Design an enzyme around this catalytic site. Structure first.
Site, PDB file in Angstrom:
ATOM      1  N   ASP A 151       0.853  -1.187   0.000  1.00 57.41           N
ATOM      2  CA  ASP A 151       0.000   0.000   0.000  1.00 57.41           C
ATOM      3  C   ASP A 151       0.897   1.249   0.000  1.00 57.41           C
ATOM      4  OD1 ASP A 151      -1.921   1.997   1.774  1.00 57.41           O
ATOM      5  OD2 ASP A 151      -3.232   0.629   0.596  1.00 57.41           O
ATOM      6  N   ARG A 152       0.716   2.247   0.889  1.00 57.66           N
ATOM      7  CA  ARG A 152       1.566   3.434   0.770  1.00 57.66           C
ATOM      8  C   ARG A 152       3.063   3.132   0.860  1.00 57.66           C
ATOM      9  NH1 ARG A 152      -2.431   5.948  -1.340  1.00 57.66           N
ATOM     10  NH2 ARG A 152      -1.320   7.934  -1.270  1.00 57.66           N
ATOM     11  N   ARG A 212       4.672   2.564  -2.316  1.00 53.92           N
ATOM     12  CA  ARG A 212       4.844   3.857  -3.039  1.00 53.92           C
ATOM     13  C   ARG A 212       6.146   4.568  -2.611  1.00 53.92           C
ATOM     14  NH1 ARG A 212       0.571   4.218  -5.986  1.00 53.92           N
ATOM     15  NH2 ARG A 212      -1.163   2.866  -5.457  1.00 53.92           N
ATOM     16  N   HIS A 240     -11.854   7.736  -0.892  1.00 51.10           N
ATOM     17  CA  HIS A 240     -10.994   8.424   0.036  1.00 51.10           C
ATOM     18  C   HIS A 240      -9.752   9.021  -0.577  1.00 51.10           C
ATOM     19  CE1 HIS A 240      -9.457   4.432  -0.217  1.00 51.10           C
ATOM     20  NE2 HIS A 240      -8.364   4.738   0.486  1.00 51.10           N
ATOM     21  N   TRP A 241      -9.325   8.511  -1.702  1.00 50.21           N
ATOM     22  CA  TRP A 241      -8.217   9.104  -2.432  1.00 50.21           C
ATOM     23  C   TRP A 241      -8.508  10.526  -2.817  1.00 50.21           C
ATOM     24  CZ3 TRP A 241      -4.733   5.830  -6.069  1.00 50.21           C
ATOM     25  CH2 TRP A 241      -4.368   4.672  -5.445  1.00 50.21           C
ATOM     26  N   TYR A 250      -1.935  11.645   0.902  1.00 47.39           N
ATOM     27  CA  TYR A 250      -2.888  11.640  -0.217  1.00 47.39           C
ATOM     28  C   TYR A 250      -2.835  12.911  -1.095  1.00 47.39           C
ATOM     29  CZ  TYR A 250      -4.775   7.165   1.175  1.00 47.39           C
ATOM     30  OH  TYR A 250      -4.942   5.835   1.420  1.00 47.39           O
ATOM     31  N   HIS A 287      -6.966  -6.764  -0.619  1.00 47.59           N
ATOM     32  CA  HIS A 287      -5.825  -5.858  -0.784  1.00 47.59           C
ATOM     33  C   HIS A 287      -4.855  -5.950   0.401  1.00 47.59           C
ATOM     34  CE1 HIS A 287      -3.544  -2.244  -1.721  1.00 47.59           C
ATOM     35  NE2 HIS A 287      -3.916  -1.633  -0.567  1.00 47.59           N
TER      36      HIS A 287
HETATM   37 CL    CL Z   1      -1.788   2.389  -2.076  1.00 48.52          CL
END
Ligand code: CL
Ligand code: CL
Lengths: 295, 295
Positions: B102-103, B106, B147-148, B209, B269
Site C-alpha cells: 500500500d503506501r 509507493r 478516500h483518495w 494523499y 488488498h
Molecule cells: Cl496504495
C-alpha cells in the site's frame, strides 16, 4: 429589499411526500427547482421578476429544505419528478415549463423525458445529464467533485462524516461552489443552514447522490438506448469555462433534444444567485420566443 | 502467540524526523514498509519468518504510527524515501531490499527510482505506480477509492471530517479494505486505532494523499519522461481480480523495470494480514532466487 415579496407559502400533501411550495403570479406556469445544498430561496433574485408575467411555483425538492418524504423513501429523480407532476396538478396545471439548477435540473430533465406532454419547455442552469457526467470522470473531475463520490458511499458513512459539524461543512461547501464570491444573502443562508442541521435533510441529500450513481444513471441509459429525447424547447445556460471534446453543454443537450439553444454565463456554477440579471435576460427571451409552446 | 517476538523497538533521530523502527535478525537486510491506515505491526505474520534468515527492519512511515516529522513538513514519497536511506544507513546498511504494501510500496518504488545503488530488490504488495492509478480513474474507481479524493482535498477539510469520530472511521476503513474478513489481530488493531486517534497522524495521512495527487505524480511523470526505470529485480504480488487492458499489475511493472516477476494472491488488498503464508512462499522464493542481487 425583501426576499420573495408576495409569495404565498404552502405545504402540499402528495401520495409520498409533504412538500414546501411558494407561489406568486398569474399567467403561464413555471416550476423552478433548486439544487444542493440549497432550498427554494436560491431563486430569490429571479422569481419575483418572473412572477410579473408568469405563474411562478418554487418547490423544495423531496428531503431538502422543508420538504420531506412520508417515510426507506425513494429519492431518485424519477420519484422527485412524480412529486412535481402532483404538485403542479394540485395547483391547477397539467402542463408547465420547468427551470432547474443543479439537482433541480436533474429532476427536471427526468420529468421531461418521462412525461413529455406535461413539460412545455425546459431550462437547465449549468447541468448536463448524469449519464454524460459519469462518462467524463477522470482524476481532475473526481478531485473537483469529490463529494459526488463521498455522498454516494453506502449508508451511513457520509451521514456520519457530514453530520459531525453540519453548519461548518454547509458553509464550506457553499463558499467552494461560489468560488469564494459573496453571493449568499445572509437570510437565505440561515435557511440553508437550518435545513443542513436537520439529519433527515443530510440523509436525503446522500440518497440523491446514491441515486445519481445507480437508478438515475440506469434511467438515462434506457432513454439513450431507446433514442428517447426531450420533446419541448430546451435552453441550457452554462458556466463560462473550457469544455473538453464531447463535453460542451450545448452539444450534449443536442444529443438529448431536437430543439436546443443556450449561452455561456460569466459566473460560478451558482447561476441563480451569482448571475441573476444575465439569467433573467436569457430566460425571459427564451420564454417569450416559445410562447406558442407554452399554450 | 506473541506479536513480533524478539523484535527490538528503536527510535531513530534523522534530519527531518523521529522514526519508530523495530528490528530482528541477521544476514542480508530487508526493509518492510506498511501502508494506510496502519503501522509496522501489519507485518506481524510475515516479519518473524523473514527474521530467521535476514536482517529485518520494520518502520512506521513518517507521520504514521509512532513516527513523526520534526515539523509544514514534507510528506511526499521522495521525503519518506530519504527517511528510509537515513534509517538503513544508521542501522549499518548502504544497500538493502525493500518490501512495501500500500503506501509503503509507493515509498519503496520512489526510493528505488531515485537511489538505484541502494535498493537491491523491490517487492510491491498490490500496488502500481500512482501515475498508472491516475490514468485509470473512472466512475467505478472513484466510488471504490473515494478516500483518495476526500483525503486530498485542501487543508483542513478532510481532517475535520475524519477527525470527528476517528476510531469509527478507522474501524470502518479497515473492515472495508479487508472485504469484511476477520484479519486484524485485536492487539495490532489497538495500535492502529491509537495512531488514528492522534490528530497529527490523521493530518500526515491527508498530506500523503495530497502528495499523491501532486508532487508524487509529477515525480513519476518525470521518470517516465526520462525513461528512468527501477534497476533491481522486482516482484509484484497482486489481488486476484479482473484487470482492464493496460491495467494488469505485471504488465504495468514491466513498463517501469526490466526485471519483473509476480503472482496473483487469493485475498483482499490487505496481503500482509490476509494471505501471509502465500506471501511468504513467494517472498522467500524471490529472495532466494536473487541472492546474487542482494550481495
Ligand atoms: Cl496504495
Ligand atoms: Cl448537479
Amino acid at each position: 429589499d425583501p426576499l420573495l415579496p408576495g409569495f404565498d407559502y404552502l405545504t402540499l400533501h402528495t401520495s409520498a411526500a409533504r412538500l414546501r411550495v411558494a407561489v406568486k403570479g398569474s399567467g403561464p406556469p413555471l416550476l423552478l427547482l433548486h439544487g444542493y445544498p440549497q432550498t427554494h430561496l436560491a431563486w430569490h433574485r429571479i422569481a419575483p421578476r418572473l412572477a410579473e408575467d408568469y405563474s411562478v411555483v418554487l418547490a423544495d425538492l423531496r428531503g431538502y429544505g422543508e420538504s420531506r418524504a412520508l417515510d426507506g423513501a425513494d429519492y431518485s429523480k424519477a420519484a422527485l419528478a412524480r412529486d412535481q407532476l402532483e404538485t403542479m396538478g394540485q395547483l391547477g396545471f397539467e402542463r408547465f415549463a420547468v427551470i432547474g439548477h443543479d439537482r433541480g435540473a436533474r429532476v427536471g430533465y427526468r420529468l421531461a423525458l418521462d412525461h413529455p406532454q406535461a413539460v412545455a419547455a425546459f431550462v437547465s442552469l449549468d447541468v448536463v445529464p448524469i449519464l454524460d457526467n459519469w462518462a467524463a470522470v477522470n482524476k481532475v473531475f473526481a478531485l473537483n467533485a469529490y463529494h459526488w463520490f463521498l455522498l454516494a458511499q453506502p449508508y451511513d458513512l457520509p451521514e456520519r462524516l457530514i453530520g459531525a459539524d453540519p453548519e461548518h461543512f454547509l458553509d464550506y461547501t457553499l463558499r467552494r461552489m461560489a468560488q469564494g464570491r459573496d453571493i449568499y444573502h445572509p437570510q437565505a443562508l440561515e435557511s440553508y443552514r437550518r435545513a443542513f442541521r436537520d439529519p433527515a435533510v443530510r440523509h436525503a441529500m446522500c440518497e440523491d447522490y446514491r441515486a445519481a450513481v445507480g437508478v438515475d444513471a440506469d434511467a438515462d441509459q434506457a432513454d439513450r438506448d431507446a433514442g428517447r429525447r426531450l420533446q419541448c424547447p430546451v435552453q441550457v445556460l452554462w458556466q463560462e469555462r473550457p469544455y473538453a471534446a464531447g463535453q460542451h453543454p450545448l452539444e450534449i443537450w443536442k444529443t438529448w433534444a431536437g430543439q436546443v439553444e443556450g449561452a455561456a454565463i460569466g459566473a460560478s456554477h451558482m447561476l441563480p444567485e451569482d448571475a441573476p440579471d444575465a439569467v433573467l435576460e436569457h430566460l425571459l427571451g427564451f420564454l417569450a420566443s416559445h410562447r406558442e409552446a407554452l399554450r
